[PDB]
Amino acid sequence: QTSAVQQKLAALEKSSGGRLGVALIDTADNTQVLYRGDERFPMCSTSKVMAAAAVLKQSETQKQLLNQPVEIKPADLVNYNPIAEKHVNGTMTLAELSAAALQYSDNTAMNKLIAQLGGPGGVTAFARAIGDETFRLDRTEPTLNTAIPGDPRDTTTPRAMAQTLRQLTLGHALGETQRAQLVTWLKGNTTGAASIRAGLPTSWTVGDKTGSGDYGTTNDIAVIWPQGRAPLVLVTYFTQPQQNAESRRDVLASAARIIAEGL
Numbered sequence: 275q276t277s278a279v280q281q282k283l284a285a286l287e288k289s290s291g292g293r294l295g296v297a298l299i300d301t302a303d304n305t306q307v308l309y310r311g312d313e314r315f316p317m318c319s320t321s322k323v324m325a326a327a328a329v330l331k332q333s334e335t336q337k338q339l340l341n342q343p344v345e346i347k348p349a350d351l352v353n354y355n356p357i358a359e360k361h362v363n364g365t366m367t368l369a370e371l372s373a374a375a376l377q378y379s380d381n382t383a384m385n386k387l388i389a390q391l392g393g394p395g396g397v398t399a400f401a402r403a404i405g406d407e408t409f410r411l412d413r414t415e416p417t418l419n420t421a422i423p424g425d426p427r428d429t430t431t432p433r434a435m436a437q438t439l440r441q442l443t444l445g446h447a448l449g450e451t452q453r454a455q456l457v458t459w460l461k462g463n464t465t466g467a468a469s470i471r472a473g474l475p476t477s478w479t480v481g482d483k484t485g486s487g488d489y490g491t492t493n494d495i496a497v498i499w500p501q502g503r504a505p506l507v508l509v510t511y512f513t514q515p516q517q518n519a520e521s522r523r524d525v526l527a528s529a530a531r532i533i534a535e536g537l
């Protein structure tokens with residue numbers, strides 16, 4: 275069937291010119307709302323959640339891992355490095371790299387997380403270990419953001435990413451202290467106010483990770499603590515037909531507003 279909410283998301287999509295993917299899990303009843311939920315979208319910076327979680331999982335058997343220093347060299351800087359550039363010719367700990375990746379979207383920090391996992395496939399292997407058969411990371415930063423239509427590299431589906439974000443933040447894919455750390459990091463995101471959270475009531479608490487890339491790709495994945503009810507997980511992915519298209523965070527906000535009105 276097509277629900278009222280799906281029809282509204284289709285009208286939003288038609289006015290946007292691009293392709294919208296949405297997945298909601300309402301943990302009040304475990305019900306879902308999906309729009310293009312099984313179509314593949316480029317993840318861009320939203321893939322940083324899986325990498326940070328995979329290092330948290332390694333830290334469950336190594337109490338000092340998050341304090342381990344990693345060297346940052348000039349050659350390591352890529353296209354967007356506001357935290358790592360302050361530590362060139364020095365070090366950052368794996369905690370500092372995780373925080374920088376998630377809260378400031380530092381792409382050099384992401385590359386150090388990927389390297390700590392043995393390369394992009396180490397991120398994909400963690401996804402598989404927590405039940406996500408869909409996610410794939412194939413490249414490092416910055417080339418994982420090319421977002422070419424039809425390219426399977428560095429993609430997932432809305433349905434898979436919502437399920438995984440639920441298990442990471444609300445379920446038991448991580449140990450309790452690691453889950454709490456991931457939630458603290460997501461709640462302190464600096465980049466999210468124009469995306470999912472802009473479509474939700476102001477009283478609701480959000481932790482999120484955004485992403486953007488070529489083809490006007492504009493993404494957000496969020497855990498939401500609504501006033502008066504059980505948490506939600508919401509994924510909104512958006513991509514456009516022309517390589518140089520502009521970001522459309524307002525489309526993600528509109529999708530979130532439609533989802534919230536449908537509760």
Ligand SMILES: *C(=O)N1C[C@H](NO[C@H](F)C(=O)O)C(C)=C[C@H]1C(N)=O
Nearest residue numbers: 318319354379419465484485486487
């Ligand atoms: C991730 O998609 N990035 C890293 C960085 N992200 O910043 C915000 F979080 C965001 O854009 O969602 C930037 C500025 C761009 C992309 C990228 N293409 O590297």
